[PDB]
Every structure is written in structure tokens, then in C-alpha cells.
Amino acid sequence: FSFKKLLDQCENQELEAPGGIATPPVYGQLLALYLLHNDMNNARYLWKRIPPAIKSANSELGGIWSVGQRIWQRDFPGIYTTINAHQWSETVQPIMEALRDATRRRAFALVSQAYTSIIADDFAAFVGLPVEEAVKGILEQGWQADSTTRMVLPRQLARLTDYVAFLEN
Amino acid sequence: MASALEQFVNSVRQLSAQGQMTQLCELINKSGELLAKNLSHLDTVLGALDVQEHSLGVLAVLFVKFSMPSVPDFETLFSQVQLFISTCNGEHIRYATDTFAGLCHQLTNALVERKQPLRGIGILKQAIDKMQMNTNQLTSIHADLCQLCLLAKCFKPALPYLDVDMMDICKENGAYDAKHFLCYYYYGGMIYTGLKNFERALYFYEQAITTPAMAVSHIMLESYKKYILVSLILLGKVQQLPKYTSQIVGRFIKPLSNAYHELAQVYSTNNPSELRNLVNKHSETFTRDNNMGLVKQCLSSLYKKNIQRLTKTFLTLSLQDMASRVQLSGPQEAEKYVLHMIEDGEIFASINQKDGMVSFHDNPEKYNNPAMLHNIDQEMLKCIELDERLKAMDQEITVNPQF
Structure with missing residues (x-):
């Protein structure tokens, strides 16, 4: 993956350059990359490793953890409310932009695999699109949309020869 | 000079x-x-x-x-x-x-x-x-x-x-040293536990128990206490110990771990009302043995086990009837718990909001994809290498004189 190479190259500089206490801007890159891969276990443990003196001095790290708090609870309407509140203009902006696309893609693979008759009033709060825009994009894909009820219905030879001589002799 | x-x-x-x-x-x-x-x-x-x-x-x-x-x-x-x-x-x-x-x-x-x-x-x-x-x-x-x-x-x-x-x-x-073989398997089991890897955590915690000894130790005590909490999440009963295991675990560690042995007895009955009373009762034992947090995963595992149990018996249970056996207090809390298992991949179900019920189907995978054949060929490459390594060690013992 393209975003998986940025996480491997960031952890190598964390255990080599600093001798004890790292830097705030590096902690914001590891926490933002863990939120994109939908890995709440490594993101929660990384937040506890940061000393309390860094969180109280750097206010940019508090906004990143606020978005990850709703991911552990898995609340779709609670993701877009925390993104447009605290942002950093450095190295987190190009990473936070990809996090909003992963939220809409996560609801697309979850509703179409668990909600065979989702309500149109509740489907708008899962992808971020309004009610007037959620019922339009589903018709161009292939999903039906009922009326007067607001209901949406989504959804070799080289290996074989080696085992012959190995088992015989 | x-x-x-x-x-x-x-x-x-x-x-x-x-x-x-x-x-x-x-x-x-x-x-x-x-x-x-x-x-x-x-x-x-x-x-x-x-x-x-x-x-x-x-x-x-x-x-x-x-x-x-x-x-x-x-x-x-x-x-x-x-x-x-x-x-x-x-x-x-x-x-x-x-x-x-x-x-x-x-x-x-x-x-x-x-x-x-x-x-x-x-x-x-x-x-x-x-x-x-x-x-x-x-x-x-x-x-x-x-x-x-x-x-x-x-x-x-x-x-x-x-x-x-x-x-x-x-x-x-x-x-x-002998202390390094017990501290490595004990520390390695905690990594697979938090990483949602119960398949590798059960094997890591089993090697630290089968090691023989003469008395009791802090590493052997924490290894048997975590072996019950791990096996209670996957299955419903604790797995048995091998024949070459140590006798101290079944004579000294077993009576001392009475707070963990009674937890598996109530888990077989599948009752969330009786499991909550054992957490507040054994709260003093979980604090003195630094086992806080490991017992919290067993509380949510009982609710997930009752949903998978109804899949074998029932097929399309109503949303209101599912809140009585699993005990979730209201049908609104039942629709939120079943959505967490879909993202993790523990079970595949579909919520039918048009009729107020939920369907429980199996996995329509016949394992006929070409990607499954590559997994068998890749797993067989490690079996032919393990046998070749055992042949070199067997010839070394034959060279040295023995009785």
C-alpha cells in the first residue's frame, strides 16, 4: 500500500534520533497514520506512551485523539464533527484529508453487508452526505429506493515434483 | 615506567x-x-x-x-x-x-x-x-x-x-537460562492478546506452563491465570494440560487459583446476570495479581457467544426476542451490538428493518478460489523445511555414543 510505507519509515526514526523524549510533531504523524488503517489497538497504546507534559503543552495532539475517540466507539455521525474542529497546518493536513475518505468507505462496506433495508433518514448520518444527496448517488450504482417510506435496499508443476522426491526418499 | x-x-x-x-x-x-x-x-x-x-x-x-x-x-x-x-x-x-x-x-x-x-x-x-x-x-x-x-x-x-x-x-x-525461557513466553502472550490474535496467544501461554519445576514462582502463577481467560474467549471451557506438564500446576497453582476456576463454570451456563456478580466478588484477587483489564474482555465475549449460539438454533429471530435471552435491555441496544461483529468479522448477519427482525446466515464461501490453493502451497513450504532440519539433528545424536 502507498500509505503503509509512511508508517514503517516513521517508526525507524523514532527509535534512533531521540535518546529518551521524542518531539511533538513526530507523535502527530504516527497517531494520524494509525487512524487511517482502522487500527484502534495500536493507536490507543501509542497515545498512552506520550508523557502528560507533552499533551498539556502541545494542543495539536489533543485534536487528533479527539477524532480517534469516536472510532473506538464506531459512531459515524461523530467522525465528521471532530474533523472540522481542530486541524494542524504542517504534516497532519495531507493525512487528515485521507481519513475523511476512509470513513465514508468504511460505512459503504458495513451498511451493504449488514443493512439489507437501511432507512433513508439514517443512511444520511452514516456517510456524511445530506438526505437530498444520499438518495441520488445510490440510484446511479444499482441500489433501489422506495417511496413514501424512506427505505433504501442496498445489498504449480515445479512444486509438485519437489514433494515427490521429498516423501519417497 | x-x-x-x-x-x-x-x-x-x-x-x-x-x-x-x-x-x-x-x-x-x-x-x-x-x-x-x-x-x-x-x-x-x-x-x-x-x-x-x-x-x-x-x-x-x-x-x-x-x-x-x-x-x-x-x-x-x-x-x-x-x-x-x-x-x-x-x-x-x-x-x-x-x-x-x-x-x-x-x-x-x-x-x-x-x-x-x-x-x-x-x-x-x-x-x-x-x-x-x-x-x-x-x-x-x-x-x-x-x-x-x-x-x-x-x-x-x-x-x-x-x-x-x-x-x-x-x-x-x-x-x-531457565528464567529467560519463562519470561519470554509470558511477555509474548500479552502482545497477541491485545492484538486480537487469540490463535497465537493460546500457544504462547501453553509453553510457559508445560515447563517442569520444583516449586512455585511468580511467572508460573501468572501464566496459568491468563490461560483460563484466553481459553474462555475462544471456546467455552479451559483446555486440558498435556501429559509432560508440571505437577506443581495441578497441586499448588490449581488450589491457589480458585477465583479463576469458578469463572469457567458459570461461563458454560451462558448467563450474563450471574457473570456480573463474580467480577465484584473477585475484585480483590484481580487487583493483587495485576490482572486488571484481562477479565474485562470476558464480559463482552459472553454477549458475542450468545449471538453465535442462536445462529445454530434459530435463523431469523425478531429484534425484540433477541433482547431477552442475551439480556440487552430494549431492542435499540440489540441493533448496535450486532453491528460491531460485522466490522470485526466474527459473524455475518443482515438486519431487516422493514419487518423488525434480523437474519442470521452462514458464510457462502466454498473455498474454490485460486487464492486458497496458494495458501496451501505456501504453508507446505514450511513443513518440508522443518523435516529437513530434524534430519540434521537426528544424525548428530547418532554420531555421539549413547546408551
Whole structure:
């Protein structure tokens, strides 16, 4: 993956350059990359490793953890409310932009695999699109949309020869 | 006549050029019975590769004091040991395993009391690659690497060193102990537990229990207490112990772990009302044995087990009837709990909001995809290699005389 190479190259500089206490801007890159891969276990443990003196001095790290708090609870309407509140203009902006696309893609693979008759009033709060825009994009894909009820219905030879001589002799 | 610091720097070159390399580990451990730092300044202008092998002995001596020499400037000692592992590396590290392993142990002890032990992870991750010949070996250095991941909550470097099974430890002059074999399997089981890898956590915790002993210990007590909580999440009963297990676990650890044995009895009945009463009752035992957090996963596992149990019996249960057996207080809480299992992949279901019910279907996978055949061929490549390694060890025993 393209975003998986940025996480491997960031952890190598964390255990080599600093001798004890790292830097705030590096902690914001590891926490933002863990939120994109939908890995709440490594993101929660990384937040506890940061000393309390860094969180109280750097206010940019508090906004990143606020978005990850709703991911552990898995609340779709609670993701877009925390993104447009605290942002950093450095190295987190190009990473936070990809996090909003992963939220809409996560609801697309979850509703179409668990909600065979989702309500149109509740489907708008899962992808971020309004009610007037959620019922339009589903018709161009292939999903039906009922009326007067607001209901949406989504959804070799080289290996074989080696085992012959190995088992015989 | 002459300084004593000059006669102790040229003696490391005679043992490194001869066939006898055992005396080299003893000369660098004492450093001429001196407790100074003048030997590190003489290995630069008279060093073969970079700092030879006498550089690790001087730094390991200063780590025994567990203090700083003068002024808060202890960063000059952590950076000196990093250049020897990366740049200098070392060629005689296979014979001097006593001083090479003890250097990483004394470095981690002096990194926790001062600042945060973060630099020690990147240093120990490079020395473990030199002792492994691309076959995943085990040693005393690998056992100390798992302890660094427990303090510094970061399981990223512990993935390439634990995803592949290890065998045949690196031995040449003595570098392992019985305490390192029990502390490695105990620390490794905690990584697979939080990583939602119960398939590997059950095997790691089973090796620390089957090891025989003579009495009781803190490692063996915490290994059996965690073996019940792990097996209670996957299945509904604790797995039995092998025949070669220790008799202390079934005579001393079993009666002492009465708070964990009664937990598996109520789990078989599948009752959330009776399981909540055992948490507040055994709260004093879970706090004195630092087992907080492990028992919280068993509370949510009972609710997930009742949903999977209804899949075999029922098919399309109503949303209101599902809140009585599982006990979720209202049908609104039932639609939120079943959505968590879809994202994790524990079960596949579909919510029918048009009729107020929920469907429970199986997995429509016949395992006919071409990707499944590649998984069998890749798994068979490790079976033919394990048998070839056992043939070399079997011929070695036949050469030596036996009874």
C-alpha cells in the first residue's frame, strides 16, 4: 500500500534520533497514520506512551485523539464533527484529508453487508452526505429506493515434483 | 615506567587473531580490573575495524553504577553503544555471547530511571539481526526485546520478530537460562492478546506452563491465570494440560487459583446476570495479581457467544426476542451490538428493518478460489523445511555414543 510505507519509515526514526523524549510533531504523524488503517489497538497504546507534559503543552495532539475517540466507539455521525474542529497546518493536513475518505468507505462496506433495508433518514448520518444527496448517488450504482417510506435496499508443476522426491526418499 | 592504560589495550588483538576466542570474553569483562573510561579513547587510533571488541566492555562497566559521572549529560553513553552495533557491528560476537547479552541488559536498566526508555528499542533491534541467519533464532537478547515493548506501549517492532515461529537457539559458549525461557513466553502472550490474535496467544501461554519445576514462582502463577481467560474467549471451557506438564500446576497453582476456576463454570451456563456478580466478588484477587483489564474482555465475549449460539438454533429471530435471552435491555441496544461483529468479522448477519427482525446466515464461501490453493502451497513450504532440519539433528545424536 502507498500509505503503509509512511508508517514503517516513521517508526525507524523514532527509535534512533531521540535518546529518551521524542518531539511533538513526530507523535502527530504516527497517531494520524494509525487512524487511517482502522487500527484502534495500536493507536490507543501509542497515545498512552506520550508523557502528560507533552499533551498539556502541545494542543495539536489533543485534536487528533479527539477524532480517534469516536472510532473506538464506531459512531459515524461523530467522525465528521471532530474533523472540522481542530486541524494542524504542517504534516497532519495531507493525512487528515485521507481519513475523511476512509470513513465514508468504511460505512459503504458495513451498511451493504449488514443493512439489507437501511432507512433513508439514517443512511444520511452514516456517510456524511445530506438526505437530498444520499438518495441520488445510490440510484446511479444499482441500489433501489422506495417511496413514501424512506427505505433504501442496498445489498504449480515445479512444486509438485519437489514433494515427490521429498516423501519417497 | 609506563601507564597501565596502554598495556590493557593491545592484549585484545592477540586473542582476536588466534583460534581460541573464549579468553576474549573474559578479558573484556574485567577491563584490567579498572573502573575508568580511558580505554575507549585508545581504541580509536589503534582499532582494526572501528573500535574492536574492547569498546563494549568499557561501556558495560559504567552501567553497573546506574548513575551519571558528572552533570546531566548521560546522552554520551547511549550514542556510543549505537555506533558499535550499526557501523562497527562485530565479527567475534558469536564467541563472546556472555558480554554481548549482558550489555543490552544493563543498558535497559539505566534507561527506565532516566527519561523514557525509547532509544533501547532501536538499539536491541539491530543486534538481534546479526545473531539470526534469516531463520528466526532465539537468545537472551530476544527475551529482553519483548520486555521493552511492555514498558513502551508500541507493538510495531515486535511484529517481524514474532510473526514467524522461532527454533534452534543460538548457543556456542552459554547465553541462555531457565528464567529467560519463562519470561519470554509470558511477555509474548500479552502482545497477541491485545492484538486480537487469540490463535497465537493460546500457544504462547501453553509453553510457559508445560515447563517442569520444583516449586512455585511468580511467572508460573501468572501464566496459568491468563490461560483460563484466553481459553474462555475462544471456546467455552479451559483446555486440558498435556501429559509432560508440571505437577506443581495441578497441586499448588490449581488450589491457589480458585477465583479463576469458578469463572469457567458459570461461563458454560451462558448467563450474563450471574457473570456480573463474580467480577465484584473477585475484585480483590484481580487487583493483587495485576490482572486488571484481562477479565474485562470476558464480559463482552459472553454477549458475542450468545449471538453465535442462536445462529445454530434459530435463523431469523425478531429484534425484540433477541433482547431477552442475551439480556440487552430494549431492542435499540440489540441493533448496535450486532453491528460491531460485522466490522470485526466474527459473524455475518443482515438486519431487516422493514419487518423488525434480523437474519442470521452462514458464510457462502466454498473455498474454490485460486487464492486458497496458494495458501496451501505456501504453508507446505514450511513443513518440508522443518523435516529437513530434524534430519540434521537426528544424525548428530547418532554420531555421539549413547546408551
